[PDB]
Symmetry: D2
Subunit: 329 residues, 4 copies
């Protein structure tokens, strides 16, 4: 009789209930993976990418580390059969713009990649929520939505979750207040064209615009426009100094994963289908405050925007549809 049989009497022998997949194990993917592991969101974690050596190596490195956590099942493969029955699938894979390549051609190359990834994801996890991180995130959330045929509640983009956190932080810096005691959103298109919603900014329900009506206008003696500028410059300076951004996006994605996996029903400014709002008729995605839970987006908060704020979202929607209508599925 073996040592196993002398030491252990077994009574019985199952399926995971909180499985997350990360597609793409570049810097961003693995930052998402380590952040998710350490918030203990998943009882099974699956990693998928096309370079088989690097992929298995990352799986093993995580596994060994995970001996010092609440150790989950970690699997990996180029084959999407390892992603079966995921509650949440996080897409970080994509193509980066090359010198002399047009925006249209770049998005089309991303579309062609998603035409392989998304149907494979849907085949193996038909009930999953899709969280799109790949840039440009507003367009590629649309792309994932179109190819998956999923309802709008189960297709989310990382959107302005991180930029809103940055905005809240710098707002705090101006007021001598911790970022956690500040509220305010950056909405619309992820990046340069994003909209600082001044009306919504408050500390303890005391709205900033009420006390200082010139906040965010050209006539602003305190020049709060410089805050939103610094939010945008913030991301570029990380890339200039370090080469790329990993930790910041990783922890923003983990924040969204937490709200979904633990049904927290917290508000996040994430890329969602925006048709019907702000005089937008086209099938585009932009960031508005959404309530995230176990079925993805359960509700939108209907933010009242000024004339100028509506114009900026409308302009972004036009630009995005301008590209989306030229894409070939």
């Amino acid at each position: 009789a073996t040592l196993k049989d002398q030491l252990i009497y077994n009574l019985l022998k199952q399926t995971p209930q909180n499985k997350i997949t990360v597609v793409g194990v570049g810097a961003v993917g693995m930052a998402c993976a380590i952040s998710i592991l350490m918030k203990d969101l998943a009882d099974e974690l699956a990693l998928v990418d096309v370079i088989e050596d690097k992929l298995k190596g990352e799986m093993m490195d995580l596994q060994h580390g995970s001996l010092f956590l609440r150790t989950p099942k970690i699997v990996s493969g180029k084959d999407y059969n390892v992603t079966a029955n995921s509650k949440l699938v996080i897409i970080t894979a994509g193509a980066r713009q090359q010198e002399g390549e047009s925006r249209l051609n770049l998005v089309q190359r991303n579309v062609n990649i998603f035409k392989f990834i998304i149907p494979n994801v849907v085949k193996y996890s038909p009930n999953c929520k899709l969280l799109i991180v790949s840039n440009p995130v507003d367009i590629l959330t649309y792309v994932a939505w179109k190819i998956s045929g999923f309802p709008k509640n189960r297709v989310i983009g990382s959107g302005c979750n991180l930029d809103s956190a940055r905005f809240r932080y710098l707002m705090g810096e101006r007021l001598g207040v911790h970022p956690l005691s500040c509220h305010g959103w950056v909405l619309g298109e992820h990046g340069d064209s994003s909209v600082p919603v001044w009306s919504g900014m408050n500390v303890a329900g005391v709205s900033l615009k009420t006390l200082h009506p010139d906040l965010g206008t050209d006539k602003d003696k305190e020049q709060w426009k410089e805050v939103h500028k610094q939010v945008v410059e913030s991301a570029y300076e990380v890339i200039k100094l370090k080469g790329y951004t990993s930790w910041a996006i990783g922890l923003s994605v983990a924040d969204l994963a937490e709200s979904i996996m633990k049904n927290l029903r917290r508000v996040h400014p994430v890329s969602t289908m925006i048709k019907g709002l702000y005089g937008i008729k086209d099938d585009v995605f932009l960031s508005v405050p959404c309530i995230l839970g176990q079925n993805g987006i359960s509700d939108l908060v209907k933010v009242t925007l000024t004339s100028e704020e509506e114009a900026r979202l409308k302009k972004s929607a036009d630009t995005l549809w301008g590209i989306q209508k030229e894409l070939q599925f």
Copy 2:
């Protein structure tokens, strides 16, 4: 009146749990992210010589830390940012080049530590030093000698990770979760490490009692293959991925947790071993140590066989053989 003064009436205008990570390579930043997310530090300092990359990593962490219990994160090539650290983690060093001798490699690491350690000591004289840089047993000695710190405040990451791997694979053999297995890998980090079969148990039922031939050459179950797989485990990560980051990061974070939160948990870490197992020389090896707010408060005196004592004694001789030739 400004918006600030209309909104906020201010009444009032040092960190108690400051950690420094020296070196922001893959291992350093894996230590940093793992420490941040276990919420161990109210201030985190990063130090390295490449100024751009360093500031970039600080900023990336800072922005991410908006989704955690946000601590103060600072960075610089200047060690003045490390002032009043409770714990300083050394990951910096030099890697062996093809045809470079062990002695020359350690000497290049010694020359680097002759800059790092005195700067650390200047700014955090009461800190615990945790050495991760390889080879870890020798470089823990190096840090000890240059710092002049007492043996309790100079620790090497040692066999903390390898012991976890060992416990896991032991579990795999027995059909048991790694957390319900006990057992250590002691001595020199790497190929020469010692699987202590006597100590291996599940729920206080010792494996060697039920199967006395466990770990010998005449072992019909061949438990020697378990320790072999622990060592091959680390190499296969390097072959497949290029380097190891996440595994060492989380092992270091485990040790940081025990120290920063005064958990008084047992870890097989590199500590001064002179006096034990008939070792006369000033060498460091991994034995079970109780880690808390003052570093190593106690050793557990593990009874070793003749063969186990011989392997530690041999490692100690090899290590002293190199240590005595180093120039400080």
Copy 3:
């Protein structure tokens, strides 16, 4: 040679860095104690009360349970020397109003008890923050402030922290929103006279009063006044059904302890010195949004109140000073 000396070689020997004291081990005190233990806020916990048997029994019951937590040092005694070097001291002890006793006489009996407790606390922990839970909490926070001679930043009352949470919850119930995604305060005097600040109530920075200006008035077709009424009736119905309230106050106190012990700089509507605000000239304490951290109250948020809201706080301040000025120290 002993088993101890054969097994363990000792290298060194200490003092606690995160010590909390709970004064009073009635239902409220022990609810505070268990809630604080299990949020892992304290490396030393001290319990103080006058009934020696019950006190030691509660200490031992906690100690044995704490073997399944990050086990802290737990001490107890009638002698305040066990409270030495507390960062935070929580006062739950006091006297309860008897049939035919006047409010003034009750407060005076509480003053006489605090004239024993507070100087003993101050003797042994001169740098501690005082958190007052004992009712009536606004007056007894003043009493603790006067006897301690502590600066206003280190003397806090549990105030409207719980009632505000209840308010946010019921606001959420009306809107079909999770309590965590609702904002709004109940300010002023703890209990019946507390003020629902309608102006501050919002979801994702969209203020409720903007969309529905009649919110909280007598001509409110949705009758949001019933929400604040239910917050007040809520507490009485617990007392009628169960006999007393323990768990709710315990977890509210633990919330405040967390912000203080972990320097979170989170906003809580707690009883603080209100002289200078809302045309109040007297030394009274009422609940306004305060930022809590390792030095207690670091900042107040200056909430803009309507004429009627100012009147209600002013009236409470007058009533409280009316009693405070008749007290004998």
Copy 4:
């Protein structure tokens, strides 16, 4: 249009995945409940007891407190339909021995109560794990097993989980070691007749009995028998000083709930069906080291016991069967 419809656009209108029931809202029940809430083990918590006022009052007090936690769904009722689809059902209800009542009559009164409780539990949660806390726990685990007809893996008693923790602590005290770095079990019948397994006691795999073979015998110069005595006296001294034990059992039960609800596969000395082991032929339950996970007891660790240790378990088994065979189902 209502304020709700102006503020929130809803996309979706579910079932709990981690539901726990606590039967009995006495001191022990509510200590289990608060401890389970604060380790965040349940997304739905159900409380059941026969006194309707007290029950609803405790539910409301918990609910209000839970606004400062990851707020779960909390329900209550005398009707077991509130317990539907529980993963784990914790039984604390039962009868206490009255003056001049025989042990047999007491157990029979507990059996008669379980003949109402257990079939109602099984009806509404047929796949649940049963955790029995009610004393005497080894007999009432058997009673629950017989009435439920559940397999032995899904019927567990709190057993020697707490007493083993106490033992480990006092072992640590002798060696100058933190309780977390000590290992050792107290096995068999809960209470006076429990067996300190000296062979299993170790620090870092260095077995105490190897260094000191006289450990636990009458000619032990260090008198380690006094340690097990103090474990037993420990529980009585809490009852003498305070009146009852709540916090200690609450946190022991929460420890077991954690291992089950989070599939930790940790070893606990819990009451399980012991027929086949240690020359025991009868259907009795005693504490042996069991691996607890999402399906309850997945494995036993087969502890080698001395002749004297086998005799003590055999004697307990005889005593327990002596009573069990006289019970009327």
